[PDB]
Motif scaffolding. Structure first.
Motif, PDB file in Angstrom:
ATOM      1  N   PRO B   7       0.961  -0.989  -0.240  1.00  0.00           N
ATOM      2  CA  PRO B   7       0.460   0.220   0.007  1.00  0.00           C
ATOM      3  C   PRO B   7       0.636   1.156  -0.072  1.00  0.00           C
ATOM      4  N   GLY B   8       0.125   2.462  -0.173  1.00  0.00           N
ATOM      5  CA  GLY B   8       1.148   3.714  -0.918  1.00  0.00           C
ATOM      6  C   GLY B   8       0.607   4.871  -1.538  1.00  0.00           C
ATOM      7  N   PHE B  10       1.632   6.972  -3.337  1.00  0.00           N
ATOM      8  CA  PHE B  10       3.107   6.082  -4.717  1.00  0.00           C
ATOM      9  C   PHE B  10       2.856   7.564  -5.688  1.00  0.00           C
ATOM     10  N   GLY B  16      12.466   3.900  -4.607  1.00  0.00           N
ATOM     11  CA  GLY B  16      12.549   2.667  -3.655  1.00  0.00           C
ATOM     12  C   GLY B  16      11.233   1.690  -3.253  1.00  0.00           C
ATOM     13  N   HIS B  17      10.327   2.492  -3.872  1.00  0.00           N
ATOM     14  CA  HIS B  17       8.896   1.380  -4.499  1.00  0.00           C
ATOM     15  C   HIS B  17       8.935   0.435  -4.995  1.00  0.00           C
ATOM     16  N   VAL B  20      11.057  -2.264  -3.594  1.00  0.00           N
ATOM     17  CA  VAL B  20      10.008  -3.346  -2.761  1.00  0.00           C
ATOM     18  C   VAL B  20       9.131  -4.259  -3.245  1.00  0.00           C
ATOM     19  N   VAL B  84       2.744  -6.025   2.795  1.00  0.00           N
ATOM     20  CA  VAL B  84       4.283  -6.297   2.533  1.00  0.00           C
ATOM     21  C   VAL B  84       4.407  -4.103   2.293  1.00  0.00           C
ATOM     22  N   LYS B  85       4.881  -3.966   3.950  1.00  0.00           N
ATOM     23  CA  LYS B  85       5.797  -2.353   3.598  1.00  0.00           C
ATOM     24  C   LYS B  85       7.214  -2.145   3.440  1.00  0.00           C
ATOM     25  N   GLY B  86       7.372  -1.399   3.109  1.00  0.00           N
ATOM     26  CA  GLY B  86       9.093  -0.717   2.833  1.00  0.00           C
ATOM     27  C   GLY B  86       9.681  -0.162   4.066  1.00  0.00           C
ATOM     28  N   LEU B  87      10.710  -0.012   4.093  1.00  0.00           N
ATOM     29  CA  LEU B  87      11.754   0.737   5.451  1.00  0.00           C
ATOM     30  C   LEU B  87      12.400   1.549   4.699  1.00  0.00           C
ATOM     31  N   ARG B  88      12.815   2.668   4.949  1.00  0.00           N
ATOM     32  CA  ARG B  88      14.143   3.435   4.023  1.00  0.00           C
ATOM     33  C   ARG B  88      14.405   4.690   4.896  1.00  0.00           C
ATOM     34  N   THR B 116      14.372  -0.989   2.386  1.00  0.00           N
ATOM     35  CA  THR B 116      15.044  -0.727   0.581  1.00  0.00           C
ATOM     36  C   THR B 116      16.445  -1.367   0.774  1.00  0.00           C
TER      37      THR B 116
HETATM   38  O1  LIG Z   1       9.255   2.694   1.268  1.00  0.00           O
HETATM   39  C1  LIG Z   1       9.927   2.872   0.058  1.00  0.00           C
HETATM   40  O2  LIG Z   1      11.254   3.376  -0.453  1.00  0.00           O
HETATM   41  C2  LIG Z   1       9.022   2.025  -0.809  1.00  0.00           C
HETATM   42  C3  LIG Z   1       8.492   0.727   0.016  1.00  0.00           C
HETATM   43  N1  LIG Z   1       7.142   1.208   0.010  1.00  0.00           N
HETATM   44  C4  LIG Z   1       6.421  -0.445   0.565  1.00  0.00           C
HETATM   45  C5  LIG Z   1       4.605   0.782   0.454  1.00  0.00           C
HETATM   46  C6  LIG Z   1       4.965   1.984   1.112  1.00  0.00           C
HETATM   47  C7  LIG Z   1       4.268   2.539   1.002  1.00  0.00           C
HETATM   48  C8  LIG Z   1       4.274   4.538   1.221  1.00  0.00           C
HETATM   49  C9  LIG Z   1       6.157   4.338   1.265  1.00  0.00           C
HETATM   50  C10 LIG Z   1       7.286   2.930   1.193  1.00  0.00           C
HETATM   51  C11 LIG Z   1       6.658   1.791   1.143  1.00  0.00           C
END
Ligand SMILES: O=C(O)CCn1ccc2ccccc21
Ligand SMILES: O=C(O)CCn1ccc2ccccc21
Ligand SMILES: O=C(O)CCn1ccc2ccccc21
Ligand SMILES: O=C(O)CCn1ccc2ccccc21
Lengths: 154, 155, 154, 157, 155, 157
Positions: B7-8, B10, B16-17, B20, B84-88, B116
């Protein structure tokens, strides 16, 4: 020919900021305080004046306003270093993100320095908030700043 | 048959997205990217969906859909119960943990976090737009098609 | 007459360390890499050699060993700045504690800089551990270092 | 004559808040729940509704009372002859901000702040996340006292 | 009648510890400082108790005792069920939270945390000893009597 | 043909570990619990004891198996034709170290790491803290599977 830029909104400048200015000025030949502009309590000129008044003892520091990309402000003055203070409540993760971005897009380095423990819980926002409701923040701000803050409230 | 939702907002999708998305598609039988419409941004929902589809053309088990309201409803409605959610760098991880525990409690949906790649760890949609607006070069941080469209919105 | 000390055990030096050395050397007139001594994988002289080999392109950087208080090492060389890198896994809270202590006891400032994302997950310990079990860390260490590490294992 | 103030907006009170109230009441002779109001932004619930929901779910704590206020927390505390704040920690707490405020409050008024971790079961609820989830139909009944849940659903409908 | 236990090794007690002791004694009817004996340090348990008593002479409702084994047993044996722990720069707060939740679960004992004053926020027993060993001046960070005894152990 | 490895020393397995195993088994076609052994330091339990305690408390998960190993985790994963690790987060997790190891593992072997937060009820247990508390008589029975608790007390006595 070393130099660094110390950026912020400084609305108003605190002793926390001043501590960092003094350390930057002690370790680099040239320091520029970059006053960010865009609606706070003090106008840009007021903020600049207050910093100039508090940094009179720092011969190698000057104060200028700017907008747009910080890296452009730094590079347009022939420098490629930023010095930023850390305090209690600093969003450090965001500062790291911005540091890595700024290095990526313009090759500018960012150096972080922790402010003195005595000035570690003051921020411009919390000082304004407390002073607004009548709390004494006179130990946390330069003497000049404190009088002028009381001026905007009363 | 396994599956997860990514989800996001985007606005726009970043590398980065995409990193993931790729890792999720490699590890689950089906992936749905959920483009969450809000009370607002630079790109329309259809534009966002289109940019993601362009960037994920090589991922046959991933699809892109818009959604609104409760994320766990979006997930369960499609017969899944994983996110599934990414971390940055700059992720509010404490908030993500709070939301994951809330989402597990109210609907039994699991959340898996993945960091990521370091190369894409300081990019976000918001910072990329901000930098690009003032003429900074973020082309190494976005899919090629996205960077092209970003220039267009700004010009 | 600006200068900073970059301290560590560097057992061995990584590209993460080298990145920080290069940035310090680009922003201060004089840099000294301080190699801490006390039982790791490389002797002090080996560690020093490996850093000297990897910093040949840095004319204003030298490498020296030391023990005792870091602030004494810095002050005895006429300086009062430390530059320290941050990586993934850095115990930053401890670094802040030490920075505030070092400022308190000797008036020495500490500047922190984040290493490049590409070198952000390497540490001397994790590189040794991985290489020990046969993993390829050649992208994470200077070419010279990598060959000599393989030498201590095989 | 020991005492502490438990401050917040409580819009609405949650079971995480109530856990902290109960621990404070067990450890201090008197506890005052301070319902702090911003006169410039309405919440979901009025001050009387907030106080009522807290009172109904604290009837078993005889040494606890509930009062509203605004302005500086340290003034609310000191005007009651106390100088301790007790504040809960949950998942998602901005602890660095809390530490900054505690040091500032000690500086300007000599008031101490004691933090306690809320129970694990109540550690992911917050007033704002509960409201947000309930807005979109999610079930938060196990995270709020009975005095709150259907009043919340009422506001939302 | 309220009360709390302030546990630690206090090898030696610092002004950071003392600040916390004072705040606890100001807020609870009774405070016990528990000097926890371990498998070891610079000062003996009796020496540590003595240094704390010297530093807390003005606190009539605070007493100092040695202890070992389970902290929550020490607390409950004295008819209390609260622990007061200080926070400083370098505290492993995540571990403290884990232990507080464990202690609540196994014995119903509450833990209250208080941040020490900024002036005393970077001192710890270990760092003070380390600095003093190499001739650094930590006299502004320790009670006067403690600093005197530290010099003695090192000489 | 999806799959993940759940690695640890599991000395002993806790209910926090079991929560993570169950979530992994619900979301991947096969799960392998990797009992990683340091041949240079004995734990409290032998490898066979560790495996036995895990097997007894995972009998209801038909797609999960348990195997020991040593050396590089990414080799254990790849030699089984997989490239995913699933790792739990609890209170007291050194998450920065976990992030460093995940990035390193992706770098050297292309293996992905997925983190999941353990249930709040099991969020403060760890093998080491459970052993320490039990050593001094504290009751950790609600934090460990039945396959573990009395075996632990046995080791301690
Ligand atoms: O954090 C990233 O760079 C991508 C990882 N990711 C996967 C879903 C999502 C939603 C919002 C922000 C980042 C997200
Ligand atoms: O809800 C929680 O988990 C934290 C417990 N807590 C106690 C007082 C208080 C005030 C505002 C917000 C949360 C508060
Ligand atoms: O952290 C401080 O500076 C003092 C606060 N405190 C109170 C008990 C205790 C035990 C160990 C370490 C610190 C402690
Ligand atoms: O116990 C927890 O809470 C974390 C859940 N978890 C899952 C795999 C694993 C390995 C080592 C330690 C903990 C682990």
């Amino acid at each position: 020919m070393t130099g660094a830029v110390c950026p912020g909104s400084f609305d108003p400048v605190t002793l926390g900021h001043l501590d960092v200015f003094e350390r930057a000025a002690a370790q680099f030949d040239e320091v520029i305080v970059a006053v960010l502009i865009n609606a706070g309590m003090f106008t840009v000129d007021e903020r600049i004046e207050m910093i100039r008044e508090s940094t009179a003892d720092l011969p190698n520091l000057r104060v200028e306003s700017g907008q747009g990309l910080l890296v452009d402000f730094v590079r347009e003055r022939g420098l490629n270093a930023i010095v930023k203070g850390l305090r209690t409540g600093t969003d450090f993760e965001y500062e790291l993100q911005m540091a890595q971005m700024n290095k990526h897009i313009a090759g500018v380095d960012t150096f972080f320095v922790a402010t003195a423990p005595a000035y570690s819980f003051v921020s411009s926002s919390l000082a304004k908030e407390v002073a607004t409701y009548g709390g004494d923040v006179s130990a946390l701000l330069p003497a000049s700043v404190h009088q002028r803050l009381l001026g905007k409230l009363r």
